[model samples]
Target: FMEKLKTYLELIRVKNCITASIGGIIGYLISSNFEIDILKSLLVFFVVFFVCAYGNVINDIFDIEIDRINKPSRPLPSGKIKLNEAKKFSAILLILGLVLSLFINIYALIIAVINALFLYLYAKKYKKYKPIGNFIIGYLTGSVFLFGGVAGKNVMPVVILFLCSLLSIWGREIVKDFEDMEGDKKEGVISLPIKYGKKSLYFATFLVVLAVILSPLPYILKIFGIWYLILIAICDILFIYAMALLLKEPNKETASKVSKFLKIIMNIVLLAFIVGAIKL
Candidate 1:
């Protein structure tokens, strides 16, 4: 039973949930003038976190077959959790998440509801659509910041942060499509890599370049300080490095490595934001 519960937790991607929660917390912090309401912020953080975890579980539930090829060790694909049980668990999380969002405000509730619905739609339908799915995923990722801003009742800093996050996520999604092209192809998932082949690499690089261009806007707008510009410069270099590798190889194996490297760079980028928020 303990092992079974662990598999369920794994399916929800507990660590990724925490990361998303932190993203929301950062959004709240930047908007809260450093005099945060601890209880409110904590509630907002956990609500958004629960929603993210729910989305991950729902995605796994729908992607079970695809995971067999691309990620056979995943809970659903590995038969560690039954589909019916997963669905029930997902429903519970969704309800709890939405209810918690309501505690924040109607705006946060609306965002949570919309994001939850989008998560379901993306998992069931959008995941197979080229680039549309990628866009939706990016939007969903950025919405976490917006939800936090709404919760904090301050929308300025988070708007720029949301755009930066959206661009980065969009670029990363394209690269992930490249990395998972084979499995996605086998499963008849028509992502950009599967549809346009190597041409998608150029498009992905363009998105990363665009994201790098946008990353400095927050600093330039004086929302952040020199610390953000310096660290984001490092992030931009890493993104370029990853893009260069993908442009050179444009193969699934190389794309996979770049995908991992980009994840690391994304963490650094998050740190840059934290530094900016603190004006350090």
Candidate 2:
């Protein structure tokens, strides 16, 4: 029973969900001087996790046809869990998410509603549309951090964090679309790369790299400190490296490797936000 439960939890990807929420929490902690209540923090953490997992599961449900060809091994498509089961689970997770948000405050509840609405809307419409669809997806992923600011009741800080994250996720999503072009194409799915051509990946990567380079301006202006500048430098170098490698060889393996490395570098910089904020 325990082992089976563990596998199901892994299937829902609780850990990655936590990481996504932590991204926002890191921004919140840094921007707010690292003064957060632990219990409230954990509640917010679960709120983000439940909402994100709801997105993932509902996305899978909507992508059942594509998954049949491209991701036959997934829990839903593979019959490890039935469609009805997935639907029930998604609903339960989302409701629990709402409940968690209400525990935080009215502002958090509002953000939670917005977040859930975006996820469902994307799965239904955005994924099928053209270029705008891609941007919507990326922006929502980045909005998790913005929502964190809402959770913390900070407007300016949340907006700044969300915009930068949206740009980064948008680029990464474009790279990912290309990286999985083979499977996606086989499944007849549309993405920025497939709609145009492989060269489009360069445009996508360029957009993100440019945004990341410019994103440190506020921090550089003394909002934080020298530590943030140092972290931004590392972020710039790693992002450049990842973009260069992907642009040079935009294959599945290379894209995967570079994206993973980019994620690690981003996490390190997020940690620096904590350090920088403390110094502030």
Candidate 3:
């Protein structure tokens, strides 16, 4: 039981769950204007957490075949967790997550159901397409804000946050495609960078630049506040720096570095959103 517990944690990839849980909470806090609800808050936390955990399990389950070659040591491929067991566990987690969403509201349940279906297909097959795959990923990653927002009853403010994350993540995916170009081609995975080469980088640049523009929109439109704008200014400079870095070299090393750098900036962007939640 003890060993299996640890193995299950590994199976689900706990780290992303933590990130997603915060996103859900932040969505609630920001949308409700830092309103506190002891019980509903509890449900939202676990809803995001359990659902994220469920997504990771299914992701690993689908990768069992590939994991044999790429990640043989994983719980599923390593034979630590049986296929049937993983399936049942995933089902339980997914169902519980959905049922809990119903407690929040019809909208939250709808998003949870849709997100679950999309995540399931994403792991199954739809991810083979070029830009479509990355776009779905971008949408899902940014969706936690929307998820949290809707759960809290006011979805308007967080929409811009969702859009910004969506654009930057898609941009990051393209740069990642550049880094993984060699292996992806060998794996027969076609991506924007693979199909259009540097042109994709141009596309990526625009995504980040556009995201930078939108970040300030919350302030200009008076949705967030002044601090949000000033803080996002920090991101704007970093975004351009990374953009210039990627443009200058366009080589694998540079792409790799830029990809990682953008993720860090994304964290800071998240920080800006969190800190910007209150007027200063």
Candidate 1 C-alpha lDDT tens digits along 126-179: 978958888887888888878888777557767777877777788889989888
TM-score for all models, in order of appearance: 0.81, 0.76, 0.92
Cα RMSD, each candidate: 3.3, 3.7, 1.9
lDDT per residue (tens digit) for residues 1-280 in model 2: 7866664675577787888788667656654566777876787678888998898888888988888898787776777777888899899999999998888778778878988888898888777664666777667766777666665633454565567667777787787777788888886678878877778777777777766766676575556677777887878777887888788887889878877887787567656655666784
- Clashes (backbone N, CA, C under 3 Å), per candidate, total 0, 0, 0
- Clash list (residue pairs), candidate 1: none
- Which is the winner by TM-score between candidate 2 and candidate 3? 3
lDDT by candidate, in order shown:
0.84, 0.75, 0.86
Q: Give a tens-digit lDDT track for model 3, residues 135-251.
A: 878988888788788866556768888999999998899898888989888888889988988889999999999998888877787777777777789889999999998998998
What order do you get sorting by lDDT, best first?
A: 3, 1, 2
- Stretches of candidate 1 off by over 4 Å are 1-13, 60-89
Candidate 1 CA-lDDT value: 0.84
